[PDB]
């Protein structure tokens, strides 16, 4: 299960022009001077901190989930939560014949537990040694405006914090960064065999 991203964000999809406004608009020094491409490097650091704590995706990037054995008999919960439209469930063998499948499975979308959940009880078996591989597109929307705005504010509360102070310096807000994230974290209570 490597789960590398196929493509990253373009960078032009990120709200750098809007984050300059969350940094100092309506109150402030002026527009002031901010290294523009620096401000893009703190948004990518705040999204990747909230993509990890929430297990969401937020920009709808393309993924590749290549894992060897199916965990359940049929279920296969996908980790990156807001999903849409499996690109392909191609199945490579130990030599690399890469024979895709086009039926036998129906992705059941959900923000809680996205699944693969094949038809009946038969999910495509794995060639011995030949890892299965699932390409999917997971996230809310293509642009920044399609996001839930409370989750978008948790990026701006966090990316501004990485802008305002560089090293790990000390400094309880009601809806802080942490309180806006907790309704998007994954609540799991299984430590068991299934």
């Amino acid at each position: 299960m490597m789960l590398n991203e196929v493509t990253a964000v373009p960078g032009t999809a990120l709200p750098v022009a809007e984050f300059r406004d969350h940094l100092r608009l309506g109150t402030g020094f002026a527009d002031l001077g901010a290294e523009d491409a620096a401000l893009l490097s703190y948004l990518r650091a705040a999204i990747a901190a909230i993509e990890g704590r929430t297990a969401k995706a937020l920009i709808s990037r393309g993924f590749r989930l290549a894992l060897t054995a199916w965990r359940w008999g049929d279920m296969q919960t996908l980790p990156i939560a807001p999903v849409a439209t499996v690109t392909a469930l191609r199945l490579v063998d130990a030599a690399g014949v890469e024979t895709p499948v086009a039926a036998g499975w129906r992705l059941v979308p959900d923000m809680a537990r996205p699944r693969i959940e094949a038809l009946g009880a038969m999910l495509p078996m794995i060639p011995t040694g030949g890892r299965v591989e699932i390409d999917f597109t997971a996230g809310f929307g293509a642009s920044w405006s399609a996001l839930p705005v409370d989750l978008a504010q948790a990026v701006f509360l966090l990316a501004a914090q990485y802008y305002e102070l560089r090293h790990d310096g000390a400094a309880a807000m009601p809806f802080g960064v942490m309180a806006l994230i907790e309704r998007w974290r994954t609540v799991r209570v299984l430590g068991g065999r299934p």
Binding site: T27, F29, D31
Partner: protein, 110 residues
């Protein structure tokens, strides 16, 4: 962080120049700000021939870029009714830059 409670009518004078080089002030009103007014230690001060009564009055408003209407320049004065607060300087009180300290007098002749 400051609790803003007073309504101060900010006032800026247009400078109609006279023939000798001296401008004539009008003190036309500008838009109103909200502010807190914190007093200092006050005592009466010898004016020209007037025993003027002054108090320091650090006034705190919100901020703006320097080329905006909402910044009190030290050209301007505040006025709450008939109590004119001159502006000595503006000094950007907050660390993040949200609030501006002003500095006043309230010189009543007394």
């Amino acid at each position: 962080r400051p609790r803003l409670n007073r309504l101060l009518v900010l006032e800026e004078a247009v400078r109609v120049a006279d023939g000798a080089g001296g401008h004539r002030l009008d003190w036309q009103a500008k838009g109103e700000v909200w502010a807190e007014v914190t007093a200092g230690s006050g005592s009466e001060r010898a004016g020209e021939f007037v025993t003027l009564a002054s108090v320091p009055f650090t006034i705190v408003v919100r901020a703006a870029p320097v080329g905006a209407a909402r910044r009190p320049r030290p050209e301007q004065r505040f006025r709450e009714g008939a109590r004119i607060f001159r502006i000595l300087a503006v000094a950007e009180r907050d660390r993040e830059g949200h609030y501006l300290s002003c500095f006043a007098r309230e010189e009543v002749v007394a």
